[PDB]
Amino acid sequence: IVGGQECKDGECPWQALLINEENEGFCGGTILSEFYILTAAHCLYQAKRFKVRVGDRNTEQEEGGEAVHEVEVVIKHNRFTKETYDFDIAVLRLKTPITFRMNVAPACLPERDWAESTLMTQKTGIVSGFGRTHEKGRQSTRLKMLEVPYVDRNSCKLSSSFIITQNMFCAGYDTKQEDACQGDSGGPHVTRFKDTYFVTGIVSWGEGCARKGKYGIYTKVTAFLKWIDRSMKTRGLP
Template sequence: MLCIMCVLAHPMEFTFALSLSVFIKRERAHHVLRKRANYFLEEMLPGDLERECYEETCSREEAREIFKSQEKTAEFWYHYKGDPCKMSPCENGGICQQYHYSYTCLCPPRFMGRHCENGEFVFNSLSPLPWFQVLIRSHRGYEICSGSLISNRWVLSAAHCFEAVNPHHVTVGDYDKFRRDQDEQKIAVLKFFSHPHYFAEHYDHDIALLYLRSPVIFNEYARPICLPTPSLGRLLTQEGEIGQVSGWGATRYMGPSSRFLLRVRLPIVKQEDCIASTAKMFTGNMFCAGYRTEVKDSCQGDSGGPFAVAYRQTWYLVGVVSWGEKCASEGKFGVYTRVANYIPWIKETIIDNDGLEDSLIATL
């Protein structure tokens, strides 16, 4: 016999409770218990862990043990917890993006890992992240082009970027262009210099210098890139040399620009093949890079950005993103301004404008 405690209330007045001891046979008691379990959705079958996970609180690790399959676990977890980004799983300023039933964390440049949990790491001289890259914006904050930091006051970019709009300021140490990064620096542009022989119709001499109002504070996320000598520049732009292109440009032809700073490695193409690939004028001030069939290339929005080559543990700026026909089109390549051809002009411009800020302030 089993003893069951029952609490009864008066059906009309609800003024008192009566506790009774009711004795029934074991078989009847089991029947009552089974019905109660059904009503309250409690676990009925011993070892029914899947049902337990649906009916009680469980962790993702427990769910993975129960459902075995990663896909089934992800599907269950999505319905179990809802939007996976709702609980902000990404650490250290990472941005959560939902992907089917799961999510991915877009980490700031100094963090990595599934949840951006692996602490800060130090970049070496050959860091894959372009710490010399800047984003150039208009006075309204619209992005114009990219550029490369070559000193604490000078930025190298493309002349075609400034045909219709003047550069207003640059952001250094930028990664997410829609959110201010921790180490980001915003600095006004005091003056810019397009090459005097820039020819817009053919993009010849497509190079420009920007002088910043105040110096960049160098740190591990903001450092200048080296310029090659003319002879080293020729060496580093030979056919087959691999360079890195980076920017916030579109990831496909006519597509939207990227929110995050992206990079791609591209081989330099033989000059004769560059000339044969286009009906446009191709001069000795240009080189081209890319793949004939592989979908990798610079694209709209990358203009003015760097084509950098690593040589003896140092990055050198050998090219500036200039022009192209569509993006990653078969048989077409991205075209870059040969920086080495302009080393004398760069030096002359910088020397001639030494103390530029003082002279401009004096005329105000």
Template sequence: MANTIDNRIILKRFRRIIRGHLAKPEQFPYQVSINNNGDHFCGGALIHEKWVLSAAHCLKYFTSTQNFYAVMGAIYLDRADPKYVQVSRVTAYFPFPRYDPWGNPNNGNITRNDHDLVLLKLQNRIQHTSRVQPIRLPNPIHDKLSLENMQQCIVSGFGTVKDTRQSHILKYLTVPIVEREQCARGHRPKRIKDFHICAGYWHGGSDACNGDSGGPLTCYSNEGPILIGIVSWGVECARHGTYGVYTRVSRYIRWINQTIERYS
């Protein structure tokens, strides 16, 4: 891990959660900013000392990770303190095998951005601190939690506001989990599948947005935060009558564990 941090590598453009709250130090130690030679383009969740989970569509237009960096422990990306922030080059990425960025009805009726997950391998092993720690993955018990027990969920990231003003600050937003049937009313019903989770507000106004993709949807249990979803897609940002759609992490635990074991 480098002892000094070049802020040009950390970020050039800033984007954020719509109507979010300013995150506090140590509040989201698993939050990752993924950038391409200094340009933040997606979020991620630290799930292992050398692995980050994000959205596969973030890498749709890239053919190499040569200039990819993962930034961890930051609240203000333009004022990254090397005492707290850790930066690692991304050396490889592994999208879920059935992910198809364009959709293919001949491939198991997969539509665009189904199975929207990617694992990013870090060059450097992270140092566990109060500001940089992996988040726990869900298990089948968490997947069966009632909606009532999952009401306190949080999405966090550095994404855009609706009027495209830019921010360098980590923001978060509390969002309610929405039943699949209700979510489908705001989208084409066949696009909402059992490997999705929907969250947000029918009236709109608060949501994840561009640049938040790949970031964590975290729900809380007695054991602490659990990574329930990864920001995937939505109709515009915070639009009335629609919800944010997240990839349901619990459906991919076997693939995650097998990939980490094979390529570590």
């Protein structure tokens, strides 16, 4: 996250972190329930093996309260397309359930129609993660958050060198130096309604970070609510 600020205790509790073989964070995720994490499909191709860390606030110290969960099932969206990042979504079922605690709680999945008319029509959403605090800088050891304005689809499309499908939206600033960045991919974009935070996007891609004339591109979660429900219906192994 470029700009924004550190998440305070309990402020960004649905943040998950995908950690690779070396136990380094490489992508983010969103806690959806005790057994399910939402992330980006593209992230799956960026580590040989991975696990999920929850409740991490600073990666440089073992503060306690962090937990690492092994992945039981990876449910990549079968329509994920590598050249466009269309259908950039995946769900992970964990081997052992998450113990909800301080700094560890699920974000709400909204109802599709209500989300379209009530969440996507807000001024802003919040993006978070451990990603680079600058395009040219280094990954944050501290979880950050950033309020990002929703950008209308037309302005989104004309700002971009690459195709913006209907399963993507733009959020962020034209020239203000605040954005998500590399390392934030897979992480939450949430929209607040009456003191309750709902999942509205997944950090997907962008040209640079906080580039002038460019926005952050997010997987549009409303397109995928029905697919997420189906993936989560499976529940545990038969």
